[PDB]
Scaffold this active site. Sequence first.
Site, short mmCIF file in Angstrom:
data_model
loop_
_atom_site.label_atom_id
_atom_site.label_comp_id
_atom_site.label_asym_id
_atom_site.label_seq_id
_atom_site.Cartn_x
_atom_site.Cartn_y
_atom_site.Cartn_z
N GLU A 3 24.08 -31.99 24.32
CA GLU A 3 24.12 -31.50 22.95
C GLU A 3 23.26 -30.27 22.66
O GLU A 3 22.57 -29.74 23.53
CB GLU A 3 23.64 -32.62 22.02
N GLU A 45 21.08 -38.80 24.95
CA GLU A 45 21.34 -40.12 25.49
C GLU A 45 20.73 -40.56 26.81
O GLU A 45 21.16 -41.54 27.41
CB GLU A 45 22.84 -40.40 25.40
N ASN A 76 20.62 -35.07 13.27
CA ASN A 76 21.54 -34.74 14.36
C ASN A 76 21.73 -33.25 14.65
O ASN A 76 21.78 -32.85 15.82
CB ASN A 76 22.90 -35.39 14.13
N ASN A 85 27.38 -34.57 10.58
CA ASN A 85 27.14 -34.07 11.93
C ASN A 85 26.81 -32.57 12.00
O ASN A 85 25.68 -32.16 11.75
CB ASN A 85 28.36 -34.41 12.79
N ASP A 129 32.29 -32.41 15.15
CA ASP A 129 30.94 -32.56 15.66
C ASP A 129 30.17 -31.27 15.37
O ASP A 129 29.82 -31.02 14.22
CB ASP A 129 30.97 -32.91 17.16
N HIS A 148 31.13 -34.56 26.03
CA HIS A 148 30.72 -35.90 26.44
C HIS A 148 31.64 -36.68 27.37
O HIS A 148 31.37 -37.85 27.64
CB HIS A 148 30.39 -36.73 25.20
CA LIG Z 1 26.21 -33.25 16.78
#
Ligand SMILES: [Ca+2]
EC number: 3.8.2.2
Length: 312
Positions: free
Chosen positions: A19, A35, A118, A173, A227, A285
Amino acid sequence: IPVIEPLFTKVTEDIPGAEGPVFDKNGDFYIVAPEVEVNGKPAGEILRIDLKTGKKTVICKPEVNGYGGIPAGCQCDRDANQLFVADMRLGLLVVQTDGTFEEIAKKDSEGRRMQGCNDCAFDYEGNLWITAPAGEVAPADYTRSMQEKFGSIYCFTTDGQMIQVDTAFQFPNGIAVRHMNDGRPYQLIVAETPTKKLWSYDIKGPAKIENKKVWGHIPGTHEGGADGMDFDEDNNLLVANHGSSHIEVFGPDGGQPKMRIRCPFEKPSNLHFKPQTKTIFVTEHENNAVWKFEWQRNGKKQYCETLKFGIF
Ligand SMILES: [Ca+2]
Ligand SMILES: [Ca+2]
């Protein structure tokens, strides 16, 4: 809807939750791995990527009181070569290139507990508009608004105020600021992932937004949705449609995408333009990797590329 299929060139791999791609004032490239986990608990990382080799170097592994962070979005500051990082567990962090960091807020301007963030977007005035899809920051039990509407929006102003500007979003987001040609900020765009919507507001001033409106519609019925996002030099908004295999391109007026960009993967997460180029770096992802492809034009200059002491 016209769909282009440019060549995606691999940049780097194996970055869990790849990200927040970002370039600092020196042109160095950064990626965050929200993550990464150690023994099932957060242990997110902020990495520097050598574009020449693709080699990864984690400069910061943020943790406050034993609670590891989940760094997910970035913006580079203008007056100092430092990174503002939205963290899903720690809120807003300011990370130096040397790897040291500082947690910006435990509570907002109203004394309310801060929520995990985020992504964020700097307007040309220096105010940072942030999306907070998670519940309260650590040590609070981790929660995220994928199913319920408790996601919030903040504005961290030049005078150091963490002001909550709105709430009740179902996973806010990506976020971006639309400016006037003379540089005046006037519109804030926010992605609400699962709902397939892009929301907009009129920026009346620092931490002052009005007239919430459904600005754009994200294609698909797949799990996911909008996103990350960013504007090109012509104010077209490219949005990573996580789970759709495409990056949507909206015109200055929004509505429906006026073009789509097919990606060689299903889950495009975030994107970022390389200063002075048409190159867009994309995180995804599916393989948890970073790629790059050429867009039709240059990107809109980030706040970090502007000058505090400029004339024009
Ligand atoms: Ca994001
Ligand atoms: Ca970006």
